Amino acid sequence: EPSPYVEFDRRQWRALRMSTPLALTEEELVGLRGLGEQIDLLEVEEVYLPLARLIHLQVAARQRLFAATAEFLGEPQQNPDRPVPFIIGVAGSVAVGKSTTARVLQALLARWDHHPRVDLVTTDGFLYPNAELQRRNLMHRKGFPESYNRRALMRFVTSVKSGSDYACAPVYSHLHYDIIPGAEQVVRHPDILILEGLNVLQTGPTLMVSDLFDFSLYVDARIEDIEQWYVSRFLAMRTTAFADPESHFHHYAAFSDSQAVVAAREIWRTINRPNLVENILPTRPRATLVLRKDADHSINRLRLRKL
Amino acid sequence: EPSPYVEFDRRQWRALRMSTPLALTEEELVGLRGLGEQIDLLEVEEVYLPLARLIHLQVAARQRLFAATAEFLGEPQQNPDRPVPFIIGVAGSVAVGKSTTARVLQALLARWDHHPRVDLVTTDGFLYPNAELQRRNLMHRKGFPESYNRRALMRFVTSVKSGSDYACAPVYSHLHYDIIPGAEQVVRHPDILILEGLNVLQTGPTLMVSDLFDFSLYVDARIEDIEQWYVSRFLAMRTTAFADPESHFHHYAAFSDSQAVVAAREIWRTINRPNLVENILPTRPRATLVLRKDADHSINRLRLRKL
Ligand SMILES: CC(C)(CO)[C@@H](O)C(=O)NCCC(=O)O
Ligand SMILES: CC(C)(CO)[C@@H](O)C(=O)NCCC(=O)O
């Protein structure tokens, strides 16, 4: 039974670190992890370092591929100070830790030798404004494929990967739970662009950003564990983000553990689980590398696409 | 407005032939074209030669990419007499000429310098036997995604691309309109494998053969023209394939131009058009190179994916 994938346990995967240096301190790591995340420097060494190696081995090889098409076309040469940007997709369910995984990865690749311009963009900013969502009757579908301005998103990544000087992306506010009027994240010809979002690995009747990814990550975990992380993180936010009177969810701060648990579960039941099951998980088979986490948040199993 | 594609008219595309030699005679070409096809040596020079170049430029570059992952993994070296097979997908509607396009391409790549083992496989053989189709009530859905043993198909391509020594594929009979009992096409570690079929470019909830393609072709034409080619070819077959008393469609041989036209159109209307519109055409955006044909069958426009 041949397979396009090859599996690894942490032991087998850490050995592939070779002599990749760790350019991240305990403090720096901290300002990168999210509430609830258990990621430590050891996990960054045994897991994120090999990955950082594999990515660098493929950034060069991926360039030969575009070089070929350039040659074929009898095109210039591609200023070495402006090669074709390596796009990386990071996917997974809400609360599975993917935003941390992305932030940490950007940190490791930025500290690679020639100091690459490694930008990071969350699909958060490509969600339709609340007003527009209400219009489409989608206010209770945030995160589902249809609640994002997919065309704009694709326009953005195509722009960057096609060598444009700069490209803009809207910015989403978690505090206000809506797109921020007039706010934009400018990305200027990075060497690497990481795109993090729920369905970035999705495929369809049109060319999508998944078709432009040169490498993709899917952070995974048993669904039940993710719900616990979700609920738990919800309760913890009563004294962090919800505490802020400006917060759209401020009314949640005064909930009892019990009341809050009921609320979190309902949201999970009606929005996040469905989206995970119907849209996110079906895209897992296509990811270059899947990071599997045990109930403790620890990455103890990995699946790589060798084909 | 940046784009992942770059378009060409025949004039611009022929210039990319450079000094690629034509190793195909008038006779040889003939035994490769299908009834109704208007392909001549000129079209092979101005269109198939550049393509043969682009493919060879990418076969090398595509190998660097697998080489990287091999290095990363600290794997052997890959016997140069056994590198990772370059898979090519050729898609398009029934009667658009794709089978010819595939056969011609195999001919050109086989006559490349080091004489590569270039195998060709049609998804014909992965259709469920008529008995099995009747069971699933699919006898009038031949060609639709669900009428193929998709799992077996994927098993086959995965086997070949993963370096297996040999892999078997069932053989379909057009004469009998069913799978041939006990017949098999053996493919032994080719250097290049071309897969031709209606929906080979299809994508889904599982890893599919489109995910294993290193390069893909989509033969295209206005839908109305394809119907005319289809109908026309149907009538012409009254004196070729349908003439054979063994032919499952022998009853069609005695049809009048009028009767046959009515029959062809009904089949097109109920089976081939729907499948083209619902399943085949939505996969066009993902093809590396689209070959567009005018009402005369002539390829006068091409769209390449540079991203
Ligand atoms: C997890 C995100 C950030 C998805 O964008 C969050 O906006 C979400 O899933 N909201 C669902 C609707 C709600 O929170 O009531
Ligand atoms: C074009 C093919 C070869 C598709 O496999 C042919 O088997 C087909 O589309 N048949 C449809 C059913 C029929 O011909 O009545």
Swiss-Prot record, chains A, B:
Gene3D superfamilies attached to this UniProt entry: P-loop containing nucleotide triphosphate hydrolases
Domain of life of the organism encoding this protein: Bacteria
The protein, known as: Pantothenate kinase
Gene name for this UniProt entry: coaA
This protein's GO CC annotations: cytoplasm
Pathway info: Cofactor biosynthesis; coenzyme A biosynthesis; CoA from (R)-pantothenate: step 1/5
Signal peptide range in chain numbering: none
Keywords, in A-Z order: ATP-binding, Coenzyme A biosynthesis, Cytoplasm, Kinase, Nucleotide-binding, Transferase
InterPro entries according to UniProt: P-loop_NTPase (IPR027417), PanK (IPR004566), PRK/URK (IPR006083)
Reactions accelerated catalytically: (R)-pantothenate + ATP = (R)-4'-phosphopantothenate + ADP + H(+)
Record's keyword annotation contains NAD: no
